[PDB]
């Protein structure tokens, strides 16, 4: 879960700087079709990890991207769809990001 | 005689109603004109005669 | 380097990483001039030097 | 006071009336290219 | 009591048809309040109070 | 026997039922039933010229030995979940069926193979009314006298290795039975566009997690819904093809859809990225937004590799996945 | 919604499509969905 | 006329569920590729069949499963007791 409110600037730049696979931004929102497409991407990504470097996978979700499809909801959907091939866990640091 | 049908009637009319349409399509002069009936919780096509 | 390897690959061209800079360029060969793949530059963002 | 491509002072009038979602949103983006590149580098397919 | 009466009238109204009249015999020996209010609540044609 | 009635009711030629009445299989002999039916077909329907010209008009491409020539004995005998995406409009139904038997026999040489599951989709109306005819021949080629179904997969042993095959014919009729829960009356109109989503719905309900290792692609009927490129872009989108899956696109007549196919599949990540991207503005309209082709768009990040091309017949293998 | 039948992003999208296509025809109305308490630990009534 | 014309009649005394029956007959008829025609006021509408025979649309039978008696309307068997009445209905 990313801060910045209705501005998708921080999640955009954090995606580039960290090598996140996806960044869900308030300007675009989160569609079910994109969510299904992106989950199938993860399904294929892990099926192709056989042989390559294990660098880890991130999805950055700006809190404002979806009020319904929340960090916690999104992650539960990933587990449901993953069918034991991989798991999903959330990371919600909070309004501490100020520094 | 008035009011909304009970749970069972809603099921009974909807199910017999669908079968009535099927019975129309599934017809030929050889196959007798039926009465959509219910027997052992099973919808049955009894002859009208 | 991660960016050059991936960008060049995406734009449909072979990327070679010249190891040990100019030394590798002058000495040449497979020893210093290796063809680099998209997954070969994995997690290099964090890597220092 | 702002960075634009140039460090420039922009009168509040033009940015409030024309360049902002004055309302409940409080925010048009520039980072569109950065987005395209990060999806390219990670193999993301949009719709 | 008024509620019981209206519950019956409501069921009666909940149907189709020409040449049909319906009589609702109401309990209430001394007053016509129940007859009048049922008549009002269910828009009855004629009340005998 | 019950099938011969279905074809006469469908306004089809008697040439099919006449074949089912002469269709015998001596499963006691040395020649495998697949080749007994294969031989019977070729000689009842005289597809001699049609097989010759199908090769001739593709620059002598061995149609009879496509997989065979290309792969080693191992490679072709390792392919276990084949998925044929309908018939070629350019070929006759008897040649189309023959080609499925030839393909099946091309994957069952060694007796040291794991079981095979073959999925034949009859996507349009013009072919869909041949499902039971196809199934009955399959029933004989595999000789399902080991342990036919109105709706169900044919299980037997096939080829020279008597390899266990488990063949499934997916069509609008089996689909029609599935929806009305095996009820007698199934004569309600079913869109071809509706057939793909329902085929998708079965794989999702069965929870099937086996990967397509050999894909047979072609030029079907109802191309507005049953397109070759879009067909692939959906199996790409849904994660249904193996990490190193093979894609075979046989045909005769040349279309833009065949030129757009090869361009996409042989193109660079930037070209694919943009290919998908254009189609989207060019075809996604509020009325058409719901469609399965704007939900399952393909994956640019998937990397194909050319392995064969002999005039309009080619094989491509999934070499990579960029992430 | 029942435990016997699978619930997912595709099924949900299909359910939304039906509801969408249904409402864009209506002109007595009001639609309902029946959710069995034990159907999905993800796609709940909520 | 391309399709099959199925006529639905609710005759006799009211019975709750007649509307649910009409809704199932209509909607199933449409689904199977027919045109469903309502015959108003029992057999009377079949005997004086003109404006008494009207088509029913998939939307016409909305919410009928919680209604009753009949939206087609009912009537007593009277003119359909005579042969000349049945002849006209035919």
Structure description:
- This is part of a larger assembly, with 4 copies of chain A, 3 copies of chain B and 1 copy of chain F (323 residues).
- By secondary structure, chain A is mainly alpha-helical.
- Chain A contains 3 helices and 2 strands.
- Chain A has helices at residues 9-18, 32-47, 71-82; strands at residues 22-24, 59-61.
- The relative contact order of chain B is 0.17.
- Chain B has a two-stranded antiparallel sheet.
- Chain B has one helix spanning 7-25; strands at residues 34-38, 43-47.
- Chain F is of the alpha/beta class and 323 residues long.
- Chain F has helices at 2-9, 17-22, 33-44, 48-56, 66-70, 73-78, 93-106, 125-128, 131-141, 172-179, 192-205, 228-237, 256-266, 269-283, and strands at 81-85, 116-122, 154-158, 163-171, 212-217, 241-249, 302-309, 314-321.
- An 8-stranded mixed β-sheet of chain F has the order 3-4-2-1-5-6-8-7, sandwiched between helices.
- Chain F is globular and about 55 Å long.
- The interface between A and F is medium-sized, with 13 and 15 residues.
Shape of chain B: elongated
The CATH superfamily of chain A is Phosphofructokinase domain
How many helices of chain A in DSSP terms?
Answer: 3
Distance between the termini of chain A: 16 Å
In which order are the strands of the major sheet of chain A placed? 1-2
Largest interface: pair, residues per side: B-H, 20 and 24 residues
* Rg calculated over all Cα atoms of chain A: 14 Å
Q: What fold name stands as the CATH topology of chain A? A: Rossmann fold
What order do the helices and strands of chain A follow?
HEHEH
Order of helices and strands of chain B: HEE
**End-to-end CA span of chain B:** 27 Å
- Return the structural class of chain B: alpha+beta
Strand order of the largest sheet of chain B: 1-2
Q: Classify the beta-strand content of chain A into a percent band.
A: 5-15%
Main β-sheet description of chain A? 2 strands, parallel
Number of strands of chain B: 2
Main sheet record of chain B: 2 strands, antiparallel
Q: Strand share of the residues of chain B?
A: 15-25%
What's the assembly state of these chains? part of a larger assembly
Percentage of residues assigned to helices of chain B: 25-40%
Number of domains of chain A: 1
């Amino acid at each position: 879960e990313v801060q910045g409110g209705n501005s998708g600037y921080i999640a955009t730049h954090a995606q580039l700087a960290c090598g996140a696979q996806i960044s869900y931004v308030p300007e675009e929102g989160i569609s079910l079709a994109q969510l299904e497409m992106d989950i199938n991407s993860l399904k294929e990504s892990f099926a192709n990890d056989q042989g390559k470097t294990k660098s880890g996978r991130l999805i950055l979700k700006s809190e404002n991207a979806s009020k319904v499809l929340t960090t916690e909801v999104i992650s539960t959907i990933i587990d449901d769809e993953a069918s034991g091939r991989f798991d999903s866990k959330t990371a919600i640091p909070g309004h501490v990001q100020q520094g | 005689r008035g009011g909304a049908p009970c749970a069972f009637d809603r099921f009974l009319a909807t199910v017999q109603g669908v079968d009535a349409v099927r019975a129309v399509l599934e017809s030929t002069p050889a196959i007798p004109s039926p009465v959509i009936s219910i027997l052992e919780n099973k919808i049955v096509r009894q002859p009208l005669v | 380097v991660r960016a050059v390897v991936r960008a060049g690959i995406y734009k449909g061209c072979k990327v070679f990483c010249i190891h040990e800079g100019y030394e590798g360029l002058v000495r040449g060969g497979e020893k210093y001039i290796k063809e680099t793949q998209w997954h070969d530059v994995r997690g290099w963002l964090v890597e220092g030097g | 006071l702002g960075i634009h491509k140039q460090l420039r002072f922009t009168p509040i009038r033009q940015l409030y009336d024309f360049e902002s979602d004055v309302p409940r949103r409080m925010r048009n983006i520039f980072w569109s290219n950065v987005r395209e590149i990060s999806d390219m580098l990670s193999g993301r397919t949009s719709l | 009591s008024l509620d019981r009466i209206c519950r019956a009238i409501d069921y009666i109204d909940a149907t189709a048809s020409h040449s049909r009249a319906f009589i609702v015999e109401v309990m209430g020996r001394h007053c016509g309040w129940l007859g009048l209010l049922a008549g009002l609540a269910t828009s009855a044609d004629y009340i005998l109070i | 026997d019950s099938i011969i009635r279905d074809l006469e009711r469908e306004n089809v030629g008697p040439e099919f039922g006449e074949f089912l009445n002469t269709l015998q299989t001596d499963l006691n002999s040395e020649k495998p039933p697949i080749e007994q039916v294969k031989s019977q077909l070729e000689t009842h329907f005289n597809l001699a010229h049609e097989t010759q010209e199908f090769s001739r008009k593709n620059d002598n491409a061995p149609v009879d030995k496509l997989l065979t020539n290309y792969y080693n004995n191992y490679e072709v005998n390792v392919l276990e979940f084949v998925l044929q995406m309908g018939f070629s409009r350019d070929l006759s139904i008897p040649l189309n069926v023959w080609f499925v038997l030839d393909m099946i026999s091309q994957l069952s040489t060694s007796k040291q193979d794991l079981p095979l599951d073959y999925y034949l989709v009859l996507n349009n109306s013009q072919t869909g009314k041949y499902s039971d005819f196809v199934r009955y021949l399959i029933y004989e080629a595999v000789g399902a006298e080991i342990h036919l179904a109105n709706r169900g997969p044919i299980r037997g042993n096939v080829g020279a290795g008597d390899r266990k095959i488990t063949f499934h014919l997916l069509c609008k009729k089996t689909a029609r039975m599935i929806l009305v829960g095996d009820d007698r009356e199934t004569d309600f109109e079913m869109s071809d566009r509706s057939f793909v989503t329902l085929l998708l719905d079965y794989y999702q309900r069965v929870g099937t997690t086996k990967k397509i290792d050999l894909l047979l692609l072609t030029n079907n009927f109802d191309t507005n819904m049953n397109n070759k490129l879009q067909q692939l872009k959906i199996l790409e989108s849904l994660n249904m093809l193996k990490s190193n899956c093979y894609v075979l696109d046989y045909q005769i007549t040349v279309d833009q859809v065949t030129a757009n196919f090869n361009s996409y599949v042989e193109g660079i990540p930037a070209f694919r990225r943009h290919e998908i991207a254009n189609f989207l503005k060019k075809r996604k309209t509020p009325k058409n937004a719901d469609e399965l082709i704007f939900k399952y768009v393909g994956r640019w990040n998937i990397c194909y590799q050319k392995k064969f091309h002999q005039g309009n017949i080619s094989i491509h293998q999934i070499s990579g996945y960029l992430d | 919604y029942t435990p016997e039948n699978p619930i997912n992003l595709q099924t949900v999208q299909e359910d939304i499509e039906l509801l969408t296509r249904t409402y864009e025809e209506d002109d007595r109305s009001g639609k309902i969905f029946i959710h069995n308490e034990k159907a999905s630990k993800v796609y709940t009534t909520d | 006329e391309g399709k099959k014309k199925i006529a639905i009649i609710t005759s006799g005394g009211d019975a709750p569920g007649m509307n649910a029956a009409v809704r199932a007959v209509t909607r199933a008829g449409i689904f199977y590729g027919c045109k469903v025609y309502a015959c108003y006021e029992g057999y009377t509408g079949l005997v004086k069949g003109g404006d008494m025979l009207k088509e029913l649309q998939w939307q016409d039978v909305r919410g009928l499963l919680s209604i009753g008696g009949t939206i087609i309307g009912t009537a007593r068997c009277k003119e359909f007791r005579e042969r000349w009445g049945r002849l006209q209905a035919c």
